[PDB]
Amino acid sequence: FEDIQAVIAEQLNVDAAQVTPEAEFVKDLGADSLDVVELIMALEEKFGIEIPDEQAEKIVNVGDVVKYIEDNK
């Protein structure tokens, strides 16, 4: 979780305090779209392998990326 915090926060100029596990990326952390896709792609660079569309389709908070990555580990 801590590392996920840091990497997502780096990825889009946001303070680590912003990322609470139910902080939506666009409504809360304030992201466009491509940025989110790239965040996901960035999280597959920690080899969660192809967290598939079905989860890209289902992702919006940052607790949402703990899921699907501890799943695909």
Partner: protein
């Protein structure tokens, strides 16, 4: 109404939405319309029944316009049924919108073969069957993104722009026998493609249309009718724009 030397039109993907309106509009103008359907024919059949209860000539037909042989045999069947085919409207279109970094080539080919390739088969078979009578009007339904381009719309934009360029080429190939090809670039048109779309992203477009409203499918249909009619007898290879001012 308008004024048509022709008798019958084939309109691909005309079961609902824009295509349904082009069919109604041409049916009401004295033309016998051949509504096309890919899958559920219940909707199409209902459209024909509506047109016939209004005292109009309509008939349903089922090919996949992306299938060459299917398209060819259905146009052959139409020629055998009515003694020839006069007008074509290449309306079949699909959209898969994704960002280019998430877009597989399957999602590119999907839109290319559905929206672009079917139009090619239609234009060629229209040449084939209208060559002999030396008369005909074809109208391809492109889009404003075929001209302007858009985000998440790489496949759709490619297909529509290819449609416009290829339609120009077909205008050259068929002009000598008075076979005219033209295109239509609708703006935001309030049919099924657009219903399920974010409301605050959709109100972002009403800002940029000077006419301050969503375009109706009937308004695209009547422009298609004018390009088919005998009025536009000196208009071939035009890319007439019907976006309410969203692009100029």
């Amino acid at each position: 109404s308008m004024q048509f030397t022709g008798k019958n039109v084939l309109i691909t993907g005309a079961s609902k939405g824009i295509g349904a309106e082009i069919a109604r509009t041409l049916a009401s103008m004295g033309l016998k319309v051949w509504i096309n359907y890919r899958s559920n024919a219940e909707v199409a059949d209902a459209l024909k029944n509506e047109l016939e209860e209004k005292g109009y000539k309509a008939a349903v037909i089922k090919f996949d316009a992306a299938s060459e042989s299917d398209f060819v045999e259905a146009i052959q069947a139409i020629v055998q049924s009515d003694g020839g085919l006069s007008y074509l409207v290449n309306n079949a279109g699909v959209v898969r919108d994704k960002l280019a970094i998430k877009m597989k080539t399957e999602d590119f080919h999907h839109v290319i073969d559905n929206n672009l390739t079917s139009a090619f088969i239609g234009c060629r078979e229209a040449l084939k069957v209208m060559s002999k009578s030396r008369f005909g009007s074809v109208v391809n339904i492109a889009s404003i993104i075929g001209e302007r381009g858009n985000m998440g719309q790489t496949n759709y934009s490619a297909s529509k722009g290819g449609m416009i360029a290829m339609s120009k080429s077909f205008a050259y190939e068929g002009a000598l026998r008075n076979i005219r090809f033209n295109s239509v670039t609708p703006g935001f048109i309030e049919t099924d493609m657009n219903a399920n779309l974010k409301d605050e992203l959709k109100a972002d477009y009403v800002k940029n249309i000077p006419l301050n409203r969503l375009g109706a499918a009937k308004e695209v249909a009547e422009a298609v009718a004018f390009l088919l009619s005998d009025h536009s007898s000196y208009i071939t290879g035009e890319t007439l724009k019907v976006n309410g001012g969203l692009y100029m």
